[PDB]
Design a protein around this ligand. Structure first.
Ligand SMILES: CCn1ccc(CN)c1
Length: 330
């Protein structure tokens, strides 16, 4: 089997991407944030505290003839931005782009933090990291991809995120029309539960490529590119007036600037992020200070190849017995 679904930016900045997902019988379609940095499929629901729902579409398990309470199971997750959610668990039929999994754990939110409430466009998350990170207790649950994998034509999914435009998540096949050149594959460590890999270096604009190993994760659920402070300083030093602002929480730059590109290495191959992809717009409405899309990972503990980086590539998440990542230009 295969599946193919369009993923759409939630706003004009590509702050996140939503993909429609069918849950239950009859189908209830929710728009979920596909997140290769986490491993829980959770949804706003009829159980979510009413004051914490503000415009989201909810899953109502009592209206699904295939929903079953997973008795005793609870979940609770916290994310890198400090947001969080928790609740109980149903199993139900979940379909993405024509690919159907029966018995998928659908984690029903009883509580969500304010940042989720405030984002009316995201009805929940669909985790695509390794199932070892799934938070369901006392019986850990598998991701949608892990459950689908044996049925898939090939044990892979691909992310093709657009810049200010829709893109595609495919399951079970590699669309050879969706990228240019060849796909360069690189090793993955699953030791931390992430699609963790080592970039071979970087370049800023037209500058010379610096060969240096950068360990990080391919994370569709993180907006920006978070890299070591040395690398990020080298980038922003090429932008007149750019500075790190403690009050804003990262590098900002004059909105009048033209940003240089940023290149990252995948083995001997190179992915070029155009400068425009690094502009996240005014820090507040009407400001002439703009927020940068490349930020320091120093306070995180891990480097994150988030959407800013991934949207410049066609990305293969290869879930074979030994997982690997593939990157192609597009
Ligand atoms: C934009 C919604 N969101 C918040 C945290 C995550 C996971 N990185 C997704």
């Amino acid at each position: 089997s295969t599946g193919s679904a369009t993923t759409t930016p939630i706003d004009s900045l590509d702050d996140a991407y939503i993909t429609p997902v069918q849950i239950g019988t009859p189908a209830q379609t929710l728009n979920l944030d596909f997140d290769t940095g986490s491993s829980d499929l959770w949804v706003f629901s009829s159980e979510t505290t009413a004051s914490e729902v503000d415009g989201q579409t909810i899953y109502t398990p009592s209206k699904s003839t295939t929903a079953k309470l997973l008795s005793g199971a609870t979940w609770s997750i916290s994310y890198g931005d400090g947001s969080s959610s928790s609740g109980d668990v149903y199993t139900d039929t979940v379909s993405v782009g024509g690919l159907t999994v029966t018995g998928q754990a659908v984690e029903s939110a009883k509580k969500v933090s304010s940042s989720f409430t405030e984002d009316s466009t995201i009805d929940g998350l669909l985790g695509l990291a390794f199932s070892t990170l799934n938070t369901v207790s006392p019986t850990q649950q598998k991701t949608f991809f892990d459950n689908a994998k044996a049925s898939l034509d090939s044990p892979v999914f691909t992310a093709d995120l657009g810049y200010h435009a829709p893109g595609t998540y495919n399951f079970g096949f590699i669309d050879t029309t969706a990228y240019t050149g060849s796909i360069t594959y690189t090793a993955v460590s699953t030791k931390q539960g992430f699609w963790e890999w080592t970039s071979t270096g970087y370049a800023v604009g037209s500058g010379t490529f610096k060969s240096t190993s950068i360990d990080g994760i391919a994370d569709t659920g993180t907006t920006l590119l978070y890299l070591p402070a040395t690398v990020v300083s080298a980038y922003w030093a090429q932008v007149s007036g750019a500075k790190s602002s403690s009050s804003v929480g990262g590098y900002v730059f004059p909105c009048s600037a033209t940003l240089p590109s940023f290149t990252f290495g995948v083995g001997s191959a190179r992915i070029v992020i155009p400068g425009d992809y690094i502009d996240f717009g005014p820090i507040s409405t009407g400001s002439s200070s703009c927020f940068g899309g490349i930020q320091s990972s120093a306070g995180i503990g891990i480097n994150i190849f988030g959407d800013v980086a991934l949207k410049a590539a066609f990305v293969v998440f290869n879930g074979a017995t030994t997982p690997t990542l593939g990157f192609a230009s597009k």
